[PDB]
A paper describes a structure:
We collected serial diffraction data for on-chip crystallized human aquaporin 2 (hAQP2) at room temperature at LCLS using the fast-scanning Roadrunner II goniometer. From two Roadrunner II chips we obtained 3377 hits from 137 476 collected frames (a 2.5% hit rate), leading to 2723 indexed patterns (an 80.6% indexing rate). The rod-shaped hAQP2 crystals showed a strong preference for two distinct orientations rotated along their long fourfold symmetry axis when lying on the flat silicon-chip surface. In order to obtain a complete data set, we tilted the chip by 25° during SX data collection. Each monomer contains a water channel surrounded by six transmembrane helices and two half-helices forming a pseudo-transmembrane helix. Despite the limited resolution of the data, clear density for a water molecule is observed in the middle of the water-conducting pore of one of the hAQP2 monomers, close to the conserved NPA region. Therefore, the weaker diffraction properties of the crystals used in this work are most likely to be owing to their significantly smaller size compared with the crystals used for previous structural determination and do not originate from our on-chip crystallization method.
Here, a new method of on-chip crystallization is reported which allows the efficient and reproducible growth of large numbers of protein crystals directly on micro-patterned silicon chips for in-situ serial crystallography experiments. Crystals are grown by sitting-drop vapor diffusion and previously established crystallization conditions can be directly applied.
Author numbering:
A (entry chain C): 5 to 226
B (entry chain A): 5 to 232
C (entry chain D): 7 to 226
D (entry chain B): 5 to 110, 115 to 238
């Protein structure tokens, strides 16, 4: 339709590429030294914040189809821009995890940090967990973008990143914290095992819609 | 216009619910390793930061009856709004603890975090520690949301959240860090562990009160006369 | 009058700073504190204190910072003496309360300042010199009046400065940067081994910093 | 203005000095006190934060030859001040490293592949690291971004933190050739030294190119537009 549209879609592609790459690659490589829950959370959150700043101003930095449909409820995002955004997000995620697999060594590929069931908890409980996780994430993103709220420079990005960090604390203790269908799809399509993939591709979306409607109809309607 | 009041009470309920959720759920689950002190303090701090961000701009996000009483002395003056806010914080807290029990497996149920007197610390020492914790938190909150700092907000949610993180370092080293009567009332009811449950309901409260009093009289009062 | 409210604000700021600082820096036998945990303690502490009492009276929380500002930005000599006095009093009283509330088996030494993993004295004097140098540099360049048209994140920035200075300075000695924070545990426990280095290390550094930032880095 | 230039190059020298001091300092290998990766990334990131604030407001705070070349391509910078900045960065870096040897009982934080697998492609890892770093640095300071004022010294700092997570896991994270040069120059371990110097540079440039030709080209002035139209 326009040129800024193409720059926006490309910014989303590169965004989810760097996010999946830096995230999965940050959490994965465990030699004698070992990454921690708070360390991985700091990784995913900090990456989300950084990309949200830069590409943030170009295209909004959704880096997530769940916040793309939760934004389709009321971010002035068209269904065409929705299709192109989720397309660039899926392809960018798969390209990021794939490039990671190409640059990462061979002893440590392991599970490529695929989210799944942890510590024996049925699928409904994980669905509820992801529901609340992406619910608070979507609440934070819709709050840090409400252009009628005074803010200092760069505080919204840090707040969204820290939200991803907290959601990675609890969500990491339950199902590795999905919060993003592309972030859980990319390592699967790179390495396999679609086991318990329905929770992820369902978890955030429910919450998304919920959260979205909330902040647009029950919490702070315009 | 009571629909804004209803959105406010609902925001208090949902916000306290999420706070108890992420707080306890991220505080107890210790299957493989242990929960690091900085990890729990970061959990509560970043959670309160996020809620104060969103439902902070919607409702102020007290997420705390003690901050509600301190606000009753300071932010406003004598309000059934403070009353209803207390009620919604209680409901949201207990509901969040129960929902946490159901979403979790009956595996790392543990104590559900009834932060008891640890490392051989007495009761009065605990009420004093918690008194100072909620003192510094109430100070930070009253300073961030002051009409004298309304020109540019400047990281209110981040400053408050990090304040909660520090208070969680010290308090966690003492009695698990309360800083919230509802947060201590929910899991003690859901799991039935009532060992030492008056300290917090006494520690924070007066502490918060003291804070308000200080910040409203010995520190920075309203202008006594417009001459200065 | 309002002056007295300011020096009371400094007294309270140092009270809570030393209390929370040494309290979180204490070595508890159920969860060994990490370097990042103590750095976060002091960092976030001075952060929120600088928020509130930074709104009130600048929140120095450091006699060395009060001296650096004395050279720097028109501060009355009696305000500096009263600030340093209230900071020392708040420090010793806060550490005293921490000593009163904490059990005996865990109050190992209230996090006294002692060099470790070998090292001399002047080496600590120049390490601490550079630590307080960067601290006062960030503090001055984050509370500038002729820059006030553009603010920023002053409290968070100063706090995280204290945090990194606590990473390196903790790996060397425990990161002083503050004579009151180093003096209160001393008075509480009569352990004064190589205590003068700090009273000289940070201090002189701050001075340098001030002069530098005001006379070389950004002269009028 | 002839003095403000010297203030700029001197602020660059001092920024690189203290930066290297704290980075390698907290990055040292202490006995019975194993520093965690997040502590290293926190040290470097917060250091970049305070230095980018302090001097950042003084002299823009490059503290990095890679971003100095990047700003030679984009942020309105001549070759003279760029070269002088680079010299100040190298000199300040080796000075800080030497001082850290003056404060260290007798490997100095200099980076090299620790894990021993897929070395050159790790050079590509450096490419992407400085890609995201330069992207965040460019978009942190854009008038078009608005948001009342800009530059959160924090914006650049936390970017450096995450980059330091991934890099520390791979090749200790270069992102800054002076940092990778000083302790090596004072420590005969030049193993795969061409990696680092090549990693950021390429990366940085690409980032600039993207942010200046693909993502958000700058609003050209008429006087420069006449230079591209001649």
């Amino acid at each position: 339709r326009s040129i800024a549209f193409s720059r926006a879609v490309f910014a989303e592609f590169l965004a989810t590429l760097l996010f999946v790459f830096f995230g999965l690659g940050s959490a994965l490589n465990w030699p004698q030294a070992l990454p921690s829950v708070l360390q991985i959370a700091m990784a995913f959150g900090l990456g989300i914040g950084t990309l949200v700043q830069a590409l943030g101003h170009i295209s909004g930095a959704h880096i997530n189809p769940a916040v793309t449909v939760a934004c389709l409820v009321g971010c002035h995002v068209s269904v065409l821009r929705a299709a192109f955004y989720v397309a660039a997000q899926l392809l960018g995620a798969v390209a990021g995890a794939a490039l990671l697999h190409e640059i990462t060594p061979a002893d440590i590929r392991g599970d490529l940090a695929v989210n799944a069931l942890s510590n024996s908890t049925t699928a409904g409980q994980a669905v509820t967990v992801e529901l609340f996780l992406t619910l608070q994430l979507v609440l934070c993103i819709f709050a840090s973008t409400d252009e009628r709220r005074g803010e200092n420079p760069g505080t919204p990005a840090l707040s969204i990143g820290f939200s991803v960090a907290l959601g990675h604390l609890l969500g990491i203790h339950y199902t590795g914290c999905s919060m993003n269908p592309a972030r859980s799809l990319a390592p699967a399509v790179v390495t396999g095992k679609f086991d318990d993939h329905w929770v992820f591709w369902i978890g955030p979306l429910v919450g998304a819609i919920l959260g979205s409607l909330l902040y647009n109809y029950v919490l702070f309607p315009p």
